[PDB]
């Protein structure tokens, strides 16, 4: 919530993404690939299960 409201105040939309699901790894991979060339904030939630 802290970084969520921080991004909201900064008015920069973010991609909150889970990690637990099997699709989550691929989703985060493409999110990183598409954000490093655009300047967006990728957010991965509870990334400790992998």
UniProtKB/Swiss-Prot annotation:
Subcellular location: Cytoplasm, Cytoskeleton
Protein origin, superkingdom: Eukaryota
Annotated disease: Charcot-Marie-Tooth disease, axonal, type 2O: An axonal form of Charcot-Marie-Tooth disease, a disorder of the peripheral nervous system, characterized by progressive weakness and atrophy, initially of the peroneal muscles and later of the distal muscles of the arms. Charcot-Marie-Tooth disease is classified in two main groups on the basis of electrophysiologic properties and histopathology: primary peripheral demyelinating neuropathies (designated CMT1 when they are dominantly inherited) and primary peripheral axonal neuropathies (CMT2). Cortical dysplasia, complex, with other brain malformations 13: An autosomal dominant disorder characterized by global developmental delay with impaired intellectual development. Some patients show signs of peripheral neuropathy, such as abnormal gait and hyporeflexia. CDCBM13 is associated with variable neuronal migration defects resulting in cortical malformations.
Role description: Cytoplasmic dynein 1 acts as a motor for the intracellular retrograde motility of vesicles and organelles along microtubules. Dynein has ATPase activity; the force-producing power stroke is thought to occur on release of ADP. Plays a role in mitotic spindle assembly and metaphase plate congression.
Quaternary organization: Homodimer. The cytoplasmic dynein 1 complex consists of two catalytic heavy chains (HCs) and a number of non-catalytic subunits presented by intermediate chains (ICs), light intermediate chains (LICs) and light chains (LCs); the composition seems to vary in respect to the IC, LIC and LC composition. The heavy chain homodimer serves as a scaffold for the probable homodimeric assembly of the respective non-catalytic subunits. The ICs and LICs bind directly to the HC dimer and dynein LCs assemble on the IC dimer. Interacts with DYNC1LI1; DYNC1LI1 and DYNC1LI2 bind mutually exclusive to DYNC1H1.
Domain notes: Dynein heavy chains probably consist of an N-terminal stem (which binds cargo and interacts with other dynein components), and the head or motor domain. The motor contains six tandemly-linked AAA domains in the head, which form a ring. A stalk-like structure (formed by two of the coiled coil domains) protrudes between AAA 4 and AAA 5 and terminates in a microtubule-binding site. A seventh domain may also contribute to this ring; it is not clear whether the N-terminus or the C-terminus forms this extra domain.
Family under the similarity heading: Belongs to the dynein heavy chain family.
Protein name: Cytoplasmic dynein 1 heavy chain 1
Organism: Homo sapiens
């Amino acid at each position: 919530g802290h970084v969520e409201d921080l991004a909201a105040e900064q008015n920069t939309q973010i991609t909150s993404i889970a990690i637990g699901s099997a699709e989550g790894f691929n989703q985060a991979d493409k999110a990183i690939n598409t954000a490093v060339k655009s300047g967006r904030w990728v957010m991965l939630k509870n990334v400790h299960l992998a």
